[PDB]
Amino acid sequence: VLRDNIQGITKPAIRRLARRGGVKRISGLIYEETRGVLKVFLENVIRDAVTYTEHAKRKTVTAMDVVYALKRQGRTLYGFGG
Amino acid sequence: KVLRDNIQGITKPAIRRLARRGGVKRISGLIYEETRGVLKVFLENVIRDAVTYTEHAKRKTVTAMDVVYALKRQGRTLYGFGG
Amino acid sequence: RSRKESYSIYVYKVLKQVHPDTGISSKAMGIMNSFVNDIFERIAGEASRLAHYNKRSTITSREIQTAVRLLLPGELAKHAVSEGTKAVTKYTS
Amino acid sequence: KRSRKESYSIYVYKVLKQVHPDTGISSKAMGIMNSFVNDIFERIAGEASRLAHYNKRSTITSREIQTAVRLLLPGELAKHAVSEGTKAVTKYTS
Amino acid sequence: HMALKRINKELSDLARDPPAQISAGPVGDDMFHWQATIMGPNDSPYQGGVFFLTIHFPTDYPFKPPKVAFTTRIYHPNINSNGSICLDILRSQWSPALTISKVLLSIASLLDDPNPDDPKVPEIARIYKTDRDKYNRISREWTQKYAM
Amino acid sequence: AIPSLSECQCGICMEILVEPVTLPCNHTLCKPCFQSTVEKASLCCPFCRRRVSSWTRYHTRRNSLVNVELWTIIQKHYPRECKLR
Amino acid sequence: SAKACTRSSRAGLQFPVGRVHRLLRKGNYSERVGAGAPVYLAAVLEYLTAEILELAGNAARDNKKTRIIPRHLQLAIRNDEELNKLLGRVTIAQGGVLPNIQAVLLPKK
Amino acid sequence: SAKACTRSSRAGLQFPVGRVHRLLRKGNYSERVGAGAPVYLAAVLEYLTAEILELAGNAARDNKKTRIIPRHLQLAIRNDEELNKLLGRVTIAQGGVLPNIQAVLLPK
Amino acid sequence: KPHRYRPGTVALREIRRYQKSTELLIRKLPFQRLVREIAQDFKTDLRFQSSAVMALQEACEAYLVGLFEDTNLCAIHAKRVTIMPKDIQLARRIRGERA
Amino acid sequence: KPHRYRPGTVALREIRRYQKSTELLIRKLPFQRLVREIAQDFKTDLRFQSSAVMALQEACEAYLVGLFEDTNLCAIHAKRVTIMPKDIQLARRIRGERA
DNA sequence: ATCGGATGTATATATCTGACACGTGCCTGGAGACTAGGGAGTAATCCCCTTGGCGGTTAAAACGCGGGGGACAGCGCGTACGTGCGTTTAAGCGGTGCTAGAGCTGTCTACGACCAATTGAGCGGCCTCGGCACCGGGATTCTCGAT
DNA sequence: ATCGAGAATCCCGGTGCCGAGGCCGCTCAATTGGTCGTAGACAGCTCTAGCACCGCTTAAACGCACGTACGCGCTGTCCCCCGCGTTTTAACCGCCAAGGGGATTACTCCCTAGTCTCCAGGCACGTGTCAGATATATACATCCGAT
Ligand SMILES: [Zn+2]
Ligand SMILES: [Zn+2]
């Protein structure tokens, strides 16, 4: 069992993502909000991925399930299949 | 039977009423031209697809179903006119 | 003339189930017809895509169940799955 | 051995060796190109299917594909793509 | 119209410097239809043969290729009995810069060595791939009676 | 330098270059020939078969198809043929 | 069940099972269609219709009316949470909008 | 066009007409499929592929490389008015983002 | 001596009035003429069903109402109550309409 | 006496550096652990292909970069240069992610 | 902190009209019985890749500190927008007339699905050599404290 | 307006490795030839509603005047991110070992498509009556200036 792994997304990683996004200066409360929204997005995608896997009577979540979930939500991904 | 600059028929009071429905209290004086341009763009985009749909069916009158199909294709489903 | 099918009478029956007193106008009937058609199309398309992905050629009740799970939000999906399972169990015997 | 899996890699490389006769392509770029081709195929073939269903027809003809290309391609691309397809048909019948 | 000037330039360039073992000209009054004759290449089993063919110019020239058809009968893997020719220059890779001289030279070079990758007649091509002697003998037998 | 008249000839119509466009493959042909092949053929270079579909699309909407330097040189050194052409 | 009455009555529903079966078969979804899929689909459609109709009837009764108009349907759909998410991109004709005013725009006390 | 040759060469295309025809017929799109539809669809697909490949090759040449990588594909797609519009929601794996710094943030 | 309301009360009154009704806020004839003009720009000699024009009007009005809501939120974000064209442009960009 | 850059000129350097590269910015193992935790919250005793985790990472990073671009635009709109949680909330609300 | 105008909204009552709800004729689509074959379920087997662990080394994260630039609050100005009134414009409604075009029906001819034999295009596997990654040294170019 | 020192980034040359491209073998799906049932192309007729016009209200749009309150610029305070140095933590890479489950193959049976016959459920059409919209007259909440 695992617990409290959202802190693995550290402050430097969020700063790097902001720099790539074109952000010059960051406040101090950004990190918790970013962690929350990332967690919500991950939950939404993984729910559909696990549903797709469960329908196929499988026990492994293949990359194609993730691709199908992302396409369903409107976030088509190129490179991993399809 | 051509027509010219009919977009001025979307008068300032109409835009004020639409903003009031949207929940706007105080309106600047340069909103009206921007809103007219946005409405023109939206109308052109929808009517192009509607005319394409009515051209494919070898017809000369655009039906409500063509408009509904065009709106659904653009991603704005409309209830109350069929489909 | 030509006959046009619609879900009007079934919608009226369900309305008389839920609210025996209230009526319904024509525009509301058109809106409900459009809603039913849209949901039918969504669920059928999702089920067909699910069958295609798994290299199948038939649409059974489990494809419909998984499509309902994928489309409807949480509580709505759970209640819809319960109702569908109940109907299938009642019909099959 | 692994079962046979089909892809557009050979045709994509054949087309690439026309625009640039001295430029190679990485494996991941081919994986992206194949996905793009599949996505556009699905889009056009679904739009044409719905278009044929609207008018109570049973056949997907070249007219339906032309109208679908007109519908889902932005501006100039459509004006070109349609043309290409037309020429191909004109070169296939005769 | 525009294609006509190309036709006169083609005819003038063919007349001033005729190619080797081939000669083409206007069979009819109109400039579209042409007749051509070709002599068998020296290093080939078609020794002593002379062959006739017709050239049909499309109404859209030079941006569309012309169609060449053998008048006589020939034993070659790439040519049927009715004169159809499987050449990529005529259909697959025609370009406006190409001239009738180039396509005629290519047709002449086909008799030097048949193309076995995409034979229009698979059976005699397989025969040729089996044994060269039998193909040579049957080609000679055909050409001493048909060509001459 | 100055190109000679022998190498200042369009390959398709065998005439003098008239608004000569230069393809990315460094092959030059007059504008009417290029337009005819674009609107009536496979949209490639007639000399070496390198398709320029994206290049043609990007340069036909800015009216930059015609090469200006070579056209000016031709029109200056050979003004006689243009009038009769 | 009895295998003697109509299919919808046997399934206990009011939506047509035969029409849903025909629409699934002729709709170009799959080569084959199962025997229990139309029952499931009809049950789901009937449940959703019943929910929306109940909410619309409540909204109409709150307005001292005995007929659901598109305004009541819009109120019922928007005031809910799951139904609003399900029909987020849908526009209801003659439905209007929910009344709300931002706190900043209200007059100062 | 004369018969007795592959279908993809009669139309002059490089994409397979037969495979496209099979996919259209067996994809549960319609009851019947016309004879000219696969040719049209293959021609359109080949045109789009050639367009993107040419733009990506130009982008790769601008980087002194002789091999197309997904970054070059992203650069080609996002620098074009129409391809960006067509591939709007599409995410290219390991493609990065275009360089763009807002004018306010630059030093004065 | 004459009575008049302070600037702001009538605006809120109109906001409360127009959020309770359901009618169309644009006159029918000018919108119909504009739609016909655009259609003529696309393809000449077209005829319009009345239901088509009504559906177009409903869709356009709903779109404009949503856009004005987003504009109001954008304006309130910048510590203001007026809505300005930059608010409309930002709302259009963030929505992905023009990118 | 030691040389120090003025505050702001190293941020633009990182902006230029990270917009020119294409690698992944979040570490692999913590992200994999987080994905596994969420998945086991959904369904117990699951296994993951490596490509699935890589696809999830790519999608998450692209989404975060786009959200940060929109947040930066929102912050600039309000006449600032820092990005604050209200900017993220407004961008998400306008994009329709929370309404 | 109220107090009095003054305005606008909400509430109760008569009435009358057209749209909703129900009944009838019927015909086209749904139900019932029967047949055949192909799709999917089930059992067995192979081996691929997913999990788990250990050791090192080192790039990346956490902690702390000086401080300078940016966020935020407060004031003043003046101009643009809200509110109200008189005037002019064209939307809305009713009524009539005309015909272009949507909609349905009957013939039938050419396009497309099905079936069987055949073989060549394309997929799986191997191998190698050049393009790209990396390292080390040097030249170029923004940057900033000091004039 | 600038000169110069410390620091980050770009060029160039040499070395190495691994995967991209080309070739070989083979199996299966695309090609070719023929047949046959049916869909939609076309011609013809009906009749619906889309278009055009005209007259009369009166409601919404327009223009103008006055005032006030809100947007914008400016100054000031302070405090919190930024840049840099040092130490701690665990990610990454390479290696080994086990076996769980994904993927393939064979056999069989039963579930669904196709067909024919039969009949009743829902659709179009017609009609009654009452739910709600409109007009008219009070009752009360609320806004604003002034004490
Ligand atoms: Zn020329
Ligand atoms: Zn060239």
Rg for chain J, CA atoms, rounded: 18
In the beta sheet, which residues pair with residue D24?
A: H67
Residues E100/E31, Cβ–Cβ less than 8 Å: no
Residue H91 domain-assigned? Answer: no
**Residues E57-76 as b or e (16 or more Cβ within 10 Å = b):** beeebbbbbbebebeebbbb
**Residue H32 main-chain phi, psi, to 5 deg:** -130, 155
Beta-strand runs (E) in F1-85: 20-22, 28-30
Protein contacts on strand L: list nucleotides below 7 Å from a Cβ. 6-9, 19-21, 28-33, 39-40, 49-52, 60-62, 67-72, 80-85, 90-92, 100-105, 111-113, 121-125, 131-132, 143-145
The SS3 assignment for E62 reads coil
Sheet with strand E22-26: strands edge to edge: E22-26, E33-39, E50-56, E67-70
Domains, chain D, in order of start with CATH, read: 26-93 (1.10.20.10)
Long-range pairs for D1-6: beta carbons < 8 A, 24 or more residues apart:
D6/H19
What is the number of other CB atoms lying within 10 angstroms of the CB of residue E143?
23
Note the CATH number of domain B6-74.
1.10.20.10
What is the number of other CB atoms lying within 10 angstroms of the CB of residue E120?
19
Give the pair of three-digit tokens for residue J36.
């596994």
Beta-strand runs (E) in H57-104: 67-68, 91-92
Protein contacts on strand K: list nucleotides below 7 Å from a Cβ. 5-9, 19-21, 28-32, 39-40, 49-51, 60-62, 67-72, 80-85, 90-92, 100-104, 111-113, 119-125, 131-132, 143-145
**Residue C14 main-chain phi, psi, to 5 deg:** -65, -40
**Residue I91 main-chain phi, psi, to 5 deg:** -65, -40
If you search the block for the tokens 């043969």, which residue do you land on? E49
Residues J92/J63, Cβ–Cβ less than 8 Å: no
Distance CA A46, CA J36 (A): 10
Which structural domain, as residue segments, surrounds residue J73? Answer: 48-99
Number of domains observed in the structure of chain I:
1
Residues E33/E54, Cβ–Cβ less than 8 Å: yes
What is the per-residue DSSP string for A1-44? -----GGGS-HHHHHHHHHHHT-SEE-SSHHHHHHHHHHHHHHH
Helices G70-79 and C26-53 meet at what angle, rounded to 10? 50
**Cross-chain residue pair I90–J74, CB shorter than 8 Å:** yes
Kindly state the helix (H) or strand (E) to which residue H22 belongs, with its residue range: helix H17-26
Q: Length of chain I, please?
A: 99
Residues 3-22 of chain C with CB under 7 A from strand K are 3, 12
Reported as half-sphere exposure (CB side, CA atoms, 13 A), residue E41 has a value of 13
Q: CA torsion, points F7, F8, F9, F10, in degrees to nearest 10?
A: 110
β-pair type (F28-30, F20-22): antiparallel
- Ligand with the closest atom to the CA of F30: 1
Distance CA G37, CA C63 (A): 8
**What's at H82, amino acid-wise?**
E
β-pair type (H67-68, D24-25): parallel
Residues J15/A24, Cβ–Cβ less than 8 Å: yes
Give the pair of three-digit tokens for residue A41.
């997005």
Number of domains observed in the structure of chain G:
1
β-pair type (E33-39, E22-26): antiparallel
Distance CA I70, CA I76 (A): 10
Distance CA E38, CA E23 (A): 7
**What's at E141, amino acid-wise?**
E
CA distances J23 to A7, A38, A81, H97, Å, are 21, 19, 20, 11
β-pair type (E67-70, E50-56): antiparallel
Q: Nearest CA to E102 among E48, E75, E66, E60?
A: E66
How is domain A6-73 classified at the architecture level of CATH? Orthogonal Bundle (1.10)
Q: How was this structure determined?
A: cryo-EM
**Cross-chain residue pair D18–F53, CB shorter than 8 Å:** no
**What's at B54, amino acid-wise?**
T
Distance CA J44, CA F30 (A): 71
**Residue G21 main-chain phi, psi, to 5 deg:** -60, -45
What separation, in Å, do the N-terminal and C-terminal C-alpha atoms of chain B show? Answer: 33
**What's at I8, amino acid-wise?**
G
Distance CA F24, CA B58 (A): 43
Domains, chain E, in order of start with CATH, read: 2-146 (3.10.110.10)
Query: What is the 8-class DSSP label of residue E41?
Result: P
Residues F36/F15, Cβ–Cβ less than 8 Å: no
Q: CA torsion, points E118, E123, E128, E133, in degrees to nearest 10?
A: -170
Q: CA torsion, points B8, B10, B13, B17, in degrees to nearest 10?
A: -160
Long-range pairs for E63-68: beta carbons < 8 A, 24 or more residues apart:
E63/E96, E63/F36, E63/F37, E63/F40, E63/F41, E64/E94, E64/F40, E64/F41, E65/E90, E65/E91, E65/E94, E66/E90, E66/E100, E66/E103, E68/E36, E68/E103, E68/E107
CA distance F13 to chain E (A): 7
Q: How far is the CA of B51 from the C1' of K97 (A)?
A: 30
Q: Is C74 exposed, middle or buried (0-12, 13-18, 19+ CB in 10 A)?
A: exposed
Q: Nearest CA to C89 among G42, G40, G46?
A: G40
What is the number of other CB atoms lying within 10 angstroms of the CB of residue E48?
11
Q: Is there contact between I2 and strand K, defined as CB under 7 Å from any strand atom?
A: yes
E86 is catalytic: yes
Breaks (C-N over 2.5 A) in chain J follow: none
Kindly state the helix (H) or strand (E) to which residue B27 belongs, with its residue range: strand B26-27
Return the biggest CA–CA distance within chain F.
36
Give the pair of three-digit tokens for residue A72.
């369903």
HEC letters along chain G? CCCCCCHHHHHCCCCCHHHHHHHHHHCCCCCEECCCHHHHHHHHHHHHHHHHHHHHHHHHHCCCCCEECHHHHHHHHHHCCHHHHHCCCEEECCCCCCCCCCCCCCCCC
Distance CA H15, CA H2 (A): 19
Distance CA F11, CA I94 (A): 53
Reported as half-sphere exposure (CB side, CA atoms, 13 A), residue I86 has a value of 12
Residues D67/B52, Cβ–Cβ less than 8 Å: yes
Helices D9-19 and H37-62 meet at what angle, rounded to 10? 60
| Smallest CA–CA distance from J20 into chain H, residue | H99
CA distances D56 to A70, B82, E111, Å, are 33, 16, 56
Distance CA B50, CA I38 (A): 12
Q: Nearest CA to D31 among A81, C49, E92?
A: A81
Query: What is the 8-class DSSP label of residue I59?
Result: H
Give the pair of three-digit tokens for residue H104.
């306010």
Q: Nearest CA to E84 among E96, E71, E93, E66?
A: E71
Domain borders along chain A are 6-73
Which structural domain, as residue segments, surrounds residue H77? Answer: 7-86
**Residue H25, CA: closest nucleotide via C1'?**
K113
Kindly state the helix (H) or strand (E) to which residue F70 belongs, with its residue range: helix F68-77
Q: Nearest CA to E129 among B69, D31, E121?
A: E121
Give the pair of three-digit tokens for residue I77.
């974000």
The SS3 assignment for E84 reads coil
Return the biggest CA–CA distance within chain G.
72
CA distances A49 to B47, H17, J98, Å, are 38, 34, 22
Q: Length of chain C, please?
A: 93
Q: Nearest CA to A21 among H102, H86, J89, I90?
A: H102
Beta-strand runs (E) in E22-145: 22-26, 33-39, 50-56, 67-70
β-pair type (A25-26, J82-83): parallel
CATH number at residue G49: 1.10.20.10
Q: How far is the CA of I12 from the C1' of L139 (A)?
A: 24
Q: Is there contact between J49 and strand K, defined as CB under 7 Å from any strand atom?
A: yes
Domain borders along chain F are 20-84
Residues near C73 by beta carbon (within 8 Å), at least 6 away in sequence? G82, G85, G86
**Cα of A37 vs its chain's centroid, Å:** 9
**What's at A66, amino acid-wise?**
V
Within 8 A of G94 by CB-CB distance, chain B residues are: 80
Q: How far is the CA of C91 from the C1' of K141 (A)?
A: 81
Give the pair of three-digit tokens for residue A63.
């990359």
**Cα of C30 vs its chain's centroid, Å:** 16
Q: How far is the CA of J73 from the C1' of K72 (A)?
A: 20
HEC letters along chain D? CCCCCCCCHHHHHHHHHHHCCCCEECHHHHHHHHHHHHHHHHHHHHHHHHHHHHCCCCEECHHHHHHHHHHHCCCHHHHHHHHHHHHHHHHHHC
Residue H100 domain-assigned? Answer: no
CA of F35 to the centre of ligand 1 (A): 10
**Residues J47-71 as b or e (16 or more Cβ within 10 Å = b):** ebbebbbbbbbbbbbbbbbbbbbbb
CATH number at residue I16: 1.10.20.10
Distance CA I50, CA E109 (A): 71
**Residue D65 main-chain phi, psi, to 5 deg:** -65, -40
Q: Which of F42, F50, F57 sits opposite D80 (nearest CB)?
A: F57
What separation, in Å, do the N-terminal and C-terminal C-alpha atoms of chain D show? Answer: 43
**Residue E35 main-chain phi, psi, to 5 deg:** -120, 140
Query: What is the 8-class DSSP label of residue E76?
Result: B
CATH 3.40.50.720: does it fit domain F20-84? no
Contacts with F, H 12-71, CB within 8 Å: 12, 47, 50-51, 54-55
